[model samples]
Structure formats: C-alpha cells, structure tokens
Target: GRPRAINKHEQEQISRLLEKGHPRQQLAIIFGIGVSTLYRYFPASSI
Candidate 1:
C-alpha cells in the first residue's frame, strides 16, 4: 500500500463521507492514506 494524495474533487467526497460519520480509520484505508494525513486534510468544521 502507498500514500494516496487526495485532490480537490476528492475533498468533497471525503466531506460527504465524513458527514455520514464514516469511521476515520476506515476512511483512511479507503483512500489509501494514513490516519494522520487524513486528519490533516480533513476540514476542521466537520468535527
């Protein structure tokens, strides 16, 4: 597995997934990224 860098379009997808309360760890795996990177990229308003 490799680090996956999300793009602007993917950002919106993440937002929707986050809104649905997708577990952070699962989200990271789906995106092929780490929890730290996912957290960093996630919008603060979501939490």
Candidate 2:
C-alpha cells in the first residue's frame, strides 16, 4: 500500500484546520492518518 504524501498545499490546509481549534484526533482521522502523523506536521515538530 502507498503511504499518504504530505505536501505544502496540504500543510497549508492542515495549518488552517489546526488553527481552527479542532481536536487533533478529529483532524487526524479526517485525514486518514494517525495522531502522531498529524503532530509531525506542526511547526513545533520541525523544531
């Protein structure tokens, strides 16, 4: 199976969605990914 690809466009979307204050778990599930995966996309994760 192919793993999902993360791109800048999606990152922008995720950033907006994340800023909207939705729970991390809800956003993760909506993206068909895991909570940890979502966490990895945040700016803090790259720090």
Candidate 3:
C-alpha cells in the first residue's frame, strides 16, 4: 500500500480535534490510519 500522506492542513485539523477532546484512538479512525501511526505523526509532547 502507498504510504499515507498527511498534509499541513490535516495536521492543523488534527490539532483542533485534539483540543476538542477527541481521543487518539478515535482520531486514528477519523484520519484513516493506525493509532501507532497517528502517534508517530503527533507525539504526546507536541500536542
């Protein structure tokens, strides 16, 4: 499978969702990626 591409726009949206109290697990589902990958993209310290 092709590597999933996450653009800056999506990153900003993800940050917004996180601020809204969306769980990482749910964000993974919403972004169509595994939770592990999501964490890789946005580490805990960065959030």
Candidate 4:
C-alpha cells in the first residue's frame, strides 16, 4: 500500500502557501500529490 505521508511541518507549509495565493492545482504539482488529497487534508473552507 502507498503511504499518505504529509506531516505537520508540511501541513504548515501548505497553509502558508495557500495564504500566499497559491492555488490548489499548483500546490498539488509542487507537493507532488493529487489535488483530491489536498482537498481532503487542506480544505479551502478551512484555509
């Protein structure tokens, strides 16, 4: 099975990126994860 490995540090970085106006699509690419994973972990409504 594939491990879904996004730690607290990464989560904080993702939040920072989101605050910096980086779209989820771009973030997915930067983080090398699927857009759906971003949505699941970092919902737009929460950010």
Candidate 5:
C-alpha cells in the first residue's frame, strides 16, 4: 500500500463522513483505501 494524499474534495468527504458518525472503516471502504490510510488523513480529531 502507499500513502494516499488528500485533496480538497476528499478532504470535504472526510469531513462529512466524520461528521455523520461514520467510522474510519466505513470511510476507507468509500475512499478505496485502508482504515489506517483513512485515519492518516484526518484534518482534525474525530468527533
């Protein structure tokens, strides 16, 4: 696996996912990445 950089659109997606109580596992599935990779791109602490 590789480091996935977050772009503006992805960042917003991440923000929304986090806002809706979506788990990193769910985000990873939606983003085509791993949970660890998903966690790595968080712009802020998970709410």
Candidate 6:
C-alpha cells in the first residue's frame, strides 16, 4: 500500500497548533502520528 500523506488541511492545522506553541510530541498525539513521522511533516525550518 502507498504511504499515507498529510493533506493540506492537516498541514494548516499543524501550522496553527504549532503557532499556538504546541510541541511536536503533543502535536503527534493530536494528529495521531508518531513523533518521528510528525517530524517529517514539520522539518527544522518549518518548525
């Protein structure tokens, strides 16, 4: 099966949550993804 991709809507949600000062660990739980996987979506520059 193909890998699951984070959609734009989710990206926006991530950005919003991040802007709210939410940490990667918490964001991972909120989005139901592993911290490592979430890291990929939120690289160093983006975060």
lDDT of 2 by residue, 1-47 (tens): 88565678887888887888777789777877788878777754442
Per-residue lDDT of candidate 4, residues 1-47 (tens digit): 87775778998999899888899899889888889998898788886
Q: Write the per-residue lDDT of candidate 5 for residues 5-37, one digit (tens) a residue.
A: 677888887878788888788777877777776
The residue pairs that clash in candidate 6, if any, are: none
The lDDT per prediction is 0.80, 0.75, 0.81, 0.86, 0.73, 0.79
List model 3 lDDT by residue over 1-47, tens digit each. 78565778998898788778789999888777788877787787876
Q: For model 1, what is the alpha-carbon lDDT of residue 26? A: 96
The true-versus-predicted C-alpha distance at residue 21 of model 5, in Å, is: 0.5
The best candidate in terms of lDDT: 4
lDDT at position 19, candidate 4:
82
The 10-residue segment with the lowest total lDDT in model 1: 38-47
Candidate with best TM-score:
4
**Candidates' TM-scores?**
0.74, 0.68, 0.71, 0.78, 0.62, 0.68
lDDT string for model 6 (1-47, tens) is 86665678988888788778889898888778788877787785775
Candidate 6 stretches greater than 4 Å from native: 3-5
On a 0 to 1 TM-score scale, where does candidate 5 land against the true structure? Answer: 0.62
Off by over 4 Å in 3: 1-3
Q: Judge candidate 2 at residue 1 and give its lDDT.
A: 83
